[PDB]
Amino acid sequence: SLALSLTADQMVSALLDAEPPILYSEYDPTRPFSEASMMGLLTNLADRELVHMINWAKRVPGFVDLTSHDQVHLLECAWLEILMIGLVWRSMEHPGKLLFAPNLLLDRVEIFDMLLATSSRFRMMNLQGEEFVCLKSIILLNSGVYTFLEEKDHIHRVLDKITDTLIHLMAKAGLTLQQQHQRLAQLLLILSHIRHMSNKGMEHLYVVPSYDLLLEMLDA
Amino acid sequence: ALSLTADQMVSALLDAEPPILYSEYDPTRPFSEASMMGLLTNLADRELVHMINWAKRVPGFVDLTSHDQVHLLECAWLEILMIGLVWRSMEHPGKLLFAPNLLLDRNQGKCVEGMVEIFDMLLATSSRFRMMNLQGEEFVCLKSIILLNSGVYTFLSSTLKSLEEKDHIHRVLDKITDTLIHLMAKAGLTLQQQHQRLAQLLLILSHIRHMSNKGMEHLYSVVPSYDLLLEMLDA
Ligand SMILES: O=S(=O)([C@@H]1C[C@@H]2O[C@H]1C(c1ccc(O)cc1)=C2c1ccc(O)cc1)N(CC(F)(F)F)c1ccc(OCCN2CCCCC2)cc1
Numbered sequence: 513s514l515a516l517s518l519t520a521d522q523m524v525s526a527l528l529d530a531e532p533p534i535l536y537s538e539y540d541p542t543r544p545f546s547e548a549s550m551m552g553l554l555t556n557l558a559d560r561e562l563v564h565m566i567n568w569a570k571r572v573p574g575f576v577d578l579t580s581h582d583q584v585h586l587l588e589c590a591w592l593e594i595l596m597i598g599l600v601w602r603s604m605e606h607p608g609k610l611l612f613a614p615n616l617l618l619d620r621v622e623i624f625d626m627l628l629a630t631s632s633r634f635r636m637m638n639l640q641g642e643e644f645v646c647l648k649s650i651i652l653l654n655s656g657v658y659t660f661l662e663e664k665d666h667i668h669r670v671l672d673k674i675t676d677t678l679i680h681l682m683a684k685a686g687l688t689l690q691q692q693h694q695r696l697a698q699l700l701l702i703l704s705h706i707r708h709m710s711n712k713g714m715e716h717l718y719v720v721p722s723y724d725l726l727l728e729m730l731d732a
Numbered sequence: 733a734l735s736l737t738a739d740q741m742v743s744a745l746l747d748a749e750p751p752i753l754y755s756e757y758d759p760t761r762p763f764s765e766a767s768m769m770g771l772l773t774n775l776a777d778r779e780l781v782h783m784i785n786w787a788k789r790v791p792g793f794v795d796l797t798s799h800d801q802v803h804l805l806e807c808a809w810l811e812i813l814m815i816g817l818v819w820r821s822m823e824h825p826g827k828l829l830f831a832p833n834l835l836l837d838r839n840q841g842k843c844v845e846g847m848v849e850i851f852d853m854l855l856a857t858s859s860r861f862r863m864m865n866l867q868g869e870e871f872v873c874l875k876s877i878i879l880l881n882s883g884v885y886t887f888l889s890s891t892l893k894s895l896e897e898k899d900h901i902h903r904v905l906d907k908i909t910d911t912l913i914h915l916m917a918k919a920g921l922t923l924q925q926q927h928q929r930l931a932q933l934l935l936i937l938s939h940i941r942h943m944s945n946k947g948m949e950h951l952y953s954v955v956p957s958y959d960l961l962l963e964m965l966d967a
């Protein structure tokens with residue numbers, strides 16, 4: 513694959529260029545807050561974000577090398593985790609609040625608390641945008657990989673490239689070899705907590721995009 | 733803003749560019765006149781939020797009062813949406829790319845009565861930009877001119893501050909002209925070619941205003957209010 517020959521810098525450049533825009537909530541600010549339904553607003557936002565997520569996924573190196581079926585499977589497994597890491601990233605510089613959108617910024621519940629905790633953890637780590645995009649791409653490629661042979665092999669190789677990229681970013685930033693491996697581990701372990709939150713979030717919803725919806729979106 | 737170089741002006745404008753939004757996903761097809769109009773309204777309204785963010789980053793714009801910023805936006809918003817539309821559609825002959833998932837040929841334009849006429853005008857503008865090889869750096873200059881120009885001749889005056897406001901706007905406009913010329917000189921165009929291409933691009937602006945006026949006459953037959961615009965700017 514062409515993707516496997518990308519350097520660290522090229523991988524970061526591709527990922528930064530692929531980033532979705534930050535969307536706004538769809539509601540008239542001239543109106544009182546009480547008119548709105550929180551769940552309604554969040555659903556409308558998420559649905560609009562999903563279209564952009566598909567476009568983003570198609571630009572993650574290696575992703576289009578996969579079958580349409582496997583692309584859908586990865587997206588089905590990752591979509592809420594991807595929405596959540598986006599949320600936490602946007603909320604980093606807003607302690608005690610979740611920036612669902614620039615016009616939908618909420619203070620303090622169980623999952624909300626978990627997301628806030630993740631956000632504060634990213635803030636304490638001084639998580640950089642270049643690291644963020646690597647991590648969100650890992651979520652895409654990893655979350656569904658163990659629930660599907662050449663397809664899996666390819667995915668694992670792209671994942672290894674992403675690891676290389678994360679280390680490269682850290683070496684470039686001035687971190688010692690010991691600091692690099694420690695920060696690599698810290699970042700990746702936070703992914704287990706993102707999985708946790710996603711599963712808890714799913715259990716709350718039960719709005720969820722179907723295999724078929726995702727397939728149609730990818731085809732279109 | 734008046735201390736920016738041409739290159740800095742271009743950089744600021746490129747960095748300010750809004751995202752390309754999507755239409756309401758999976759609408760009923762075929763469209764009715766009502767459903768198409770509904771989709772276009774929904775799109776436009778979402779684009780407007782991002783336009784405000786963009787406007788606030790156009791050098792010189794925030795130097796104006798909130799009132800004057802709203803006045804400019806009131807006069808320019810549809811023209812700005814339309815030059816965006818024509819720019820997005822350049823590489824799609826015979827079609828208008830309202831959004832990546834809403835790409836319509838003239839046949840589909842006929843779905844709303846009287847619309848095909850303006851659809852044709854927009855297609856014509858888009859082909860004109862394509863034939864001229866309009867550059868992204870030129871596009872952002874032009875869209876910024878629309879913002880600052882369209883409402884400039886319909887402010888009140890009388891007051892010293894108001895005369896200074898208009899003067900400032902005109903100075904920013906002159907800087908944008910300088911920037912356009914700079915881009916052309918940098919590209920290797922002769923002085924005569926530069927002045928000709930400048931005039932061609934600005935004359936196309938009169939046609940964009942025309943199409944905007946025709947488009948506005950349909951919307952009034954949806955339009956963001958002074959209050960909505962002011963709130964968006966404040967937020
Ligand atoms: O180009 S438009 O002028 C403008 C484009 C699109 O439609 C408008 C619009 C919009 C904006 C806000 C909104 O809320 C709804 C729609 C558009 C927009 C939205 C987002 C965006 O990024 C770009 C554009 N246009 C479409 C085109 F002809 F070109 F195809 C158009 C032209 C003629 C019409 O009728 C004439 C006949 N009529 C006259 C009066 C009596 C009854 C008969 C009708 C529409």
Ligand SMILES: [Cl-]
Binds near residue numbers: 754778
């Ligand atoms: Cl949007």
